[model samples]
Target: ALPLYNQQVGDCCIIRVSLDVDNGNMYKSILVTSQDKAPAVIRKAMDKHNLEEEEPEDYELLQILSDDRKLKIPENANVFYAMNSTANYDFVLKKRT
Candidate 1:
């Protein structure tokens, strides 16, 4: 069971989103709230990288932290605070295997 985003959440937060592209490691700023889902953010980020043809289920939104470990954020999870890492971090959008 999961809660969807068509509801309430006031403020905004910043998440630096990037695709797992070999062309470059470019990242973008995504403004989201507690109502934002990982899958929704994935498509937005994918569009910037010109990879709009693929399905969201084929990918995963992950947090690459400075601690040399990856944190997996579910596609249905509200990502406003999901990207939080005490250390430096980046929300990496990559293909899920």
Candidate 2:
């Protein structure tokens, strides 16, 4: 088993959430921890657009991979470790058709 490193870095980070449909995008700086979940990250972005969650399928968090396939991240996944930060990894918000 790989050894886990537990470090207490109580700082926040800014992430760019792009609207895949248009040229719209927003930057959000948020406090992150290994315990941070995926839903919270998405909700923060939705709030930026003043989006109301009337329907669960209204929007979704889609991670763009190198193959251009959408990767659905589990709501329980840790935001800090679940995605790559070096690549300026963007979690795009897409409106469902």
For all predicted structures, in order, the TM-scores are 0.58, 0.48
> Candidate 2, residues 8-87: lDDT per residue as tens digits?
34544555555554334454433344455566665666666553432233555656556534565444435434554434
Model 2, residue 6: distance off in Å is: 22
| Clashing pairs in model 2, backbone N/Cα/C closer than 3 A | none
Task: Please list all clashing residue pairs in model 1, or write none if there are none.
Answer: none
Q: What is the lDDT of residue 13 in candidate 1?
A: 46
Candidate 2 lands at a TM-score of: 0.48
Cα lDDT of all candidates, in order?
0.60, 0.51
Q: How much is the lDDT of residue 11 in candidate 1?
A: 64
RMSD of each: 8.6, 8.1
Give Cα distance to truth, residue 59, candidate 1, Å: 1.2
